Amino acid sequence: CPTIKLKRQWGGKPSLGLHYQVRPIRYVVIHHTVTGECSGLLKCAEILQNMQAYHQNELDFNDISYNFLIGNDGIVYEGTGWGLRGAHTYGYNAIGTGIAFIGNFVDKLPSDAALQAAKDLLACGVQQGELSEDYALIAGSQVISTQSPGLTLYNEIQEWPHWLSNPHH
Numbered sequence: 001c002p003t004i005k006l007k008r009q010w011g012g013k014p015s016l017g018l019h020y021q022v023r024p025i026r027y028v029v030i031h032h033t034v035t036g037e038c039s040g041l042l043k044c045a046e047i048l049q050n051m052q053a054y055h056q057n058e059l060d061f062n063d064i065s066y067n068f069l070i071g072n073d074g075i076v077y078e079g080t081g082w083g084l085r086g087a088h089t090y091g092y093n094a095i096g097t098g099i100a101f102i103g104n105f106v107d108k109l110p111s112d113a114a115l116q117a118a119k120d121l122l123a124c125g126v127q128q129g130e131l132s133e134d135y136a137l138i139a140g141s142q143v144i145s146t147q148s149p150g151l152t153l154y155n156e157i158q159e160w161p162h163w164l165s166n167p168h169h
Contacts, residue, residue, distance in 0.1 A: 105153035
């Protein structure tokens with residue numbers, strides 16, 4: 001079970017509005033940030049802080065759009081966190097957990113540590129009752145008009161158990 005970097009622990013601002021999710025959650029949506037990569041708290045916190053500010057100020061979201069975000073270091077950074085609605089995926093915020101790999105993975109994969117942290121996050125979520133034992137894992141590109149999480153990353157995750165090939169758009 002990965003130790004999650006909580007919101008305060010990376011210097012993030014409190015959410016401007018809470019919307020509680022049903023438990024358990026049935027969909028996990030995978031994204032990339034279309035940002036540079038990062039490792040370690042110092043560079044990861046800068047990106048997340050700027051991203052949250054952009055989401056709250058320019059995009060009018062209550063908080064950083066993703067539920068969780070994962071760095072090259074293989075640490076899971078709390079975005080909206082478990083049980084709270086983000087704004088990462090149209091039609092899948094209330095009923096989904098949005099997980100973004102930090103970086104751009106059209107042409108490359110995230111680090112092995114990032115990929116393993118993600119699998120651990122999903123298994124622990126099932127174990128803790130955060131996710132349905134038969135949760136569906138999907139790419140953002142399956143359900144909204146986007147390339148996220150990037151073709152290469154997309155090719156990776158369609159091989160994990162729980163991948164669902166036909167989620168509703």
